[PDB]
Amino acid sequence: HMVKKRVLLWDYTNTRDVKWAMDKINFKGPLHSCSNWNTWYPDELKHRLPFRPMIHGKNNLTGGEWQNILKTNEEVIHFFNEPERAGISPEEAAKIWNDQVLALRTSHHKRLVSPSCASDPAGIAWIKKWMNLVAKNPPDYLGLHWYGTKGDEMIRYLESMHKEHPHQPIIVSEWASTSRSYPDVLGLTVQLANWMDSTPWVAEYALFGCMRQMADDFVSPEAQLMNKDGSFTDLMWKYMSDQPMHI
Ligand SMILES: OC[C@H]1O[C@@H](O[C@@H]2[C@@H](O)[C@H](O)O[C@H](CO)[C@H]2O)[C@H](O)[C@@H](O)[C@@H]1O
């Protein structure tokens, strides 16, 4: 039986410059869903994967951005992206969650992923307090990011967050090796892909790096899933073609 819980992170820069790249995807592999950090739909997907709209920040709560969220036929919707690094307090996000985001479950019967905070103390403390404030109306999924070089350390973090918040499944909305050594990137990617596949309470995980330009200095050139011409790397090929993954 083919395990399929691998999210295709499709950065909006792909939609802008290299639409045609989406047709070079392998859809007969472990690829399961798609997301693009936005409310709007990447048309080049042509509904070949379930799409998860995201309410990225306070700028996607009004106008056309909110209409995109209200009118979607897609089943699962993400809340804020790393709100702790954008001046959104747990008090704030909780009061938005109750007043407008809740309606998407109670009325439109959508499943809601929590805000995906970073795996640093500030992020862990932010989700801890938010989940507590909205405990009477909890999210359907716990959203996590993880970045580092030690695969054994990502596992303990997921095991640690599953222990702290045991009442729903986990989605890893972003993750990658930050290692500048490719064998250590390939090594980590392959380890956790195979590990998360056979962990029942991990619903889906989303490998970062599918975009032409480097997102920032923090992430690794060796962990890129798309070359500068829009073609796919070997890491991307294996990510979307191989289950189990292999080095
Ligand atoms: O096996 C999982 C771990 O893989 C590590 O990379 C390996 C290198 O340390 C080793 O020297 O070479 C092999 C390939 O021959 C690599 O797979 C990662 O550094 C770890 O993050 C990971 O847990």
CSV table of C-alpha atoms in Angstrom, one decimal, residues 41-200:
chain,number,residue,atom,x,y,z
A,41,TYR,CA,-5.9,28.7,-5.8
A,42,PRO,CA,-2.9,27.8,-8.1
A,43,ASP,CA,-4.9,27.0,-11.3
A,44,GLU,CA,-1.9,25.1,-12.9
A,45,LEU,CA,-2.6,22.4,-10.2
A,46,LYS,CA,-5.8,21.6,-12.2
A,47,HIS,CA,-7.3,19.9,-9.0
A,48,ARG,CA,-4.8,16.9,-9.3
A,49,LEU,CA,-4.2,17.3,-5.5
A,50,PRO,CA,-6.4,18.6,-2.7
A,51,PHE,CA,-5.4,22.3,-2.0
A,52,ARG,CA,-5.2,23.8,1.5
A,53,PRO,CA,-5.9,27.5,1.5
A,54,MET,CA,-4.0,29.5,4.2
A,55,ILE,CA,-5.1,32.6,6.2
A,56,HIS,CA,-1.4,33.8,6.3
A,57,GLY,CA,-1.8,37.0,8.4
A,58,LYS,CA,-4.1,39.9,9.4
A,59,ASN,CA,-4.0,41.1,5.7
A,60,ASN,CA,-6.0,38.0,4.6
A,61,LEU,CA,-9.0,38.6,6.9
A,62,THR,CA,-10.8,41.2,4.7
A,63,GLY,CA,-11.7,41.9,1.0
A,64,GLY,CA,-10.9,39.5,-1.9
A,65,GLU,CA,-8.6,37.5,0.4
A,66,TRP,CA,-11.5,36.6,2.8
A,67,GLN,CA,-13.9,35.9,-0.2
A,68,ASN,CA,-11.3,33.3,-1.5
A,69,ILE,CA,-11.6,31.6,1.9
A,70,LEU,CA,-15.4,31.8,2.2
A,71,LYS,CA,-16.0,30.4,-1.4
A,72,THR,CA,-13.5,27.5,-1.5
A,73,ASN,CA,-14.7,23.9,-2.1
A,74,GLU,CA,-11.4,22.6,-0.6
A,75,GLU,CA,-11.8,20.8,2.8
A,76,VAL,CA,-8.8,21.9,5.0
A,77,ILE,CA,-7.7,25.6,5.8
A,78,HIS,CA,-4.5,26.7,7.6
A,79,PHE,CA,-4.5,29.7,10.1
A,80,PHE,CA,-1.7,32.2,10.6
A,81,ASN,CA,1.9,31.5,9.4
A,82,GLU,CA,4.5,32.0,12.3
A,83,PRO,CA,2.3,34.7,14.0
A,84,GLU,CA,4.8,35.1,16.8
A,85,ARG,CA,7.3,36.7,14.3
A,86,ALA,CA,4.5,39.1,13.0
A,87,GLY,CA,3.3,40.9,16.2
A,88,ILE,CA,0.1,38.7,16.5
A,89,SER,CA,-0.3,37.7,20.2
A,90,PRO,CA,-2.1,34.5,21.2
A,91,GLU,CA,-4.9,36.8,22.7
A,92,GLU,CA,-5.3,38.5,19.3
A,93,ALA,CA,-5.3,35.3,17.1
A,94,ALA,CA,-7.7,33.5,19.6
A,95,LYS,CA,-10.2,36.5,19.4
A,96,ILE,CA,-10.0,36.3,15.5
A,97,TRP,CA,-10.3,32.5,15.7
A,98,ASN,CA,-13.6,32.8,17.7
A,99,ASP,CA,-15.1,35.8,15.8
A,100,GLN,CA,-14.6,34.8,12.1
A,101,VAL,CA,-12.4,31.6,11.5
A,102,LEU,CA,-14.6,29.3,13.7
A,103,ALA,CA,-17.6,30.0,11.3
A,104,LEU,CA,-15.6,28.0,8.6
A,105,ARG,CA,-16.2,24.8,10.7
A,106,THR,CA,-19.6,25.5,12.4
A,107,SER,CA,-21.2,26.8,9.1
A,108,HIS,CA,-19.0,25.8,6.0
A,109,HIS,CA,-17.8,22.5,7.7
A,110,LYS,CA,-14.1,23.0,6.9
A,111,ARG,CA,-11.3,21.4,9.0
A,112,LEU,CA,-8.9,24.1,10.6
A,113,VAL,CA,-5.1,23.8,11.1
A,114,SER,CA,-3.7,25.8,14.1
A,115,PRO,CA,-1.2,28.7,13.4
A,116,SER,CA,2.1,27.0,12.3
A,117,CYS,CA,4.8,28.6,14.7
A,118,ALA,CA,8.6,28.0,14.5
A,119,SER,CA,10.2,25.2,16.6
A,120,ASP,CA,12.1,27.8,18.8
A,121,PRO,CA,11.1,28.6,22.4
A,122,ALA,CA,9.0,31.7,21.3
A,123,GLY,CA,7.0,29.6,18.8
A,124,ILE,CA,6.4,26.7,21.2
A,125,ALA,CA,5.3,29.1,24.0
A,126,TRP,CA,3.0,31.0,21.5
A,127,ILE,CA,1.1,27.8,20.3
A,128,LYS,CA,1.0,26.5,23.9
A,129,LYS,CA,-0.9,29.6,25.2
A,130,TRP,CA,-3.1,29.9,22.0
A,131,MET,CA,-4.3,26.2,22.1
A,132,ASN,CA,-5.1,26.9,25.8
A,133,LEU,CA,-7.2,30.1,25.0
A,134,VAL,CA,-9.2,28.2,22.3
A,135,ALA,CA,-9.4,24.8,24.2
A,136,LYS,CA,-13.3,24.7,24.1
A,137,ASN,CA,-13.1,25.1,20.2
A,138,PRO,CA,-9.8,23.3,19.4
A,139,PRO,CA,-8.3,23.1,15.8
A,140,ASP,CA,-8.7,19.8,13.8
A,141,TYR,CA,-4.9,19.7,13.1
A,142,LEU,CA,-1.8,21.0,15.0
A,143,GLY,CA,0.4,22.9,12.5
A,144,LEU,CA,4.3,22.8,13.0
A,145,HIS,CA,7.4,24.0,11.3
A,146,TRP,CA,10.9,22.4,11.9
A,147,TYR,CA,14.4,23.5,10.6
A,148,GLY,CA,17.8,22.0,11.6
A,149,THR,CA,20.6,19.5,10.6
A,150,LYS,CA,19.8,16.6,13.1
A,151,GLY,CA,16.9,14.3,12.0
A,152,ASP,CA,16.9,12.7,15.5
A,153,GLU,CA,16.1,16.2,16.9
A,154,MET,CA,13.1,16.8,14.6
A,155,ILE,CA,11.6,13.4,15.7
A,156,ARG,CA,11.9,14.3,19.5
A,157,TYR,CA,10.2,17.7,18.7
A,158,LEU,CA,7.2,16.0,16.9
A,159,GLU,CA,7.1,13.3,19.7
A,160,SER,CA,7.4,16.2,22.3
A,161,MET,CA,4.6,18.3,20.6
A,162,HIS,CA,2.3,15.2,20.2
A,163,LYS,CA,2.8,14.6,24.0
A,164,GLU,CA,2.1,18.3,24.9
A,165,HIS,CA,-1.0,18.6,22.4
A,166,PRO,CA,-2.3,15.0,22.2
A,167,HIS,CA,-6.0,15.7,21.1
A,168,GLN,CA,-5.5,16.0,17.3
A,169,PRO,CA,-3.2,14.9,14.5
A,170,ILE,CA,0.0,16.9,13.4
A,171,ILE,CA,0.7,18.6,10.0
A,172,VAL,CA,4.3,19.6,9.4
A,173,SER,CA,3.4,22.6,7.2
A,174,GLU,CA,7.1,23.4,6.6
A,175,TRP,CA,10.4,21.5,7.2
A,176,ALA,CA,13.9,21.1,5.7
A,177,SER,CA,17.5,20.3,6.5
A,178,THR,CA,19.4,23.6,6.9
A,179,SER,CA,22.7,21.6,6.4
A,180,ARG,CA,25.2,22.9,3.7
A,181,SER,CA,26.3,19.2,3.3
A,182,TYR,CA,24.0,17.5,0.7
A,183,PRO,CA,24.5,13.9,2.1
A,184,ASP,CA,23.3,15.3,5.5
A,185,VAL,CA,20.3,17.0,3.7
A,186,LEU,CA,19.4,13.8,1.7
A,187,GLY,CA,20.1,11.8,4.9
A,188,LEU,CA,17.7,13.8,7.2
A,189,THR,CA,15.0,14.2,4.4
A,190,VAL,CA,15.0,10.4,3.7
A,191,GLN,CA,15.0,9.5,7.5
A,192,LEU,CA,12.0,11.7,8.5
A,193,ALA,CA,9.9,11.1,5.3
A,194,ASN,CA,10.1,7.3,6.0
A,195,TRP,CA,9.6,7.9,9.8
A,196,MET,CA,6.6,10.4,9.4
A,197,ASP,CA,5.0,8.0,6.8
A,198,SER,CA,4.6,5.2,9.4
A,199,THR,CA,3.6,7.5,12.3
A,200,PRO,CA,-0.2,7.5,12.4
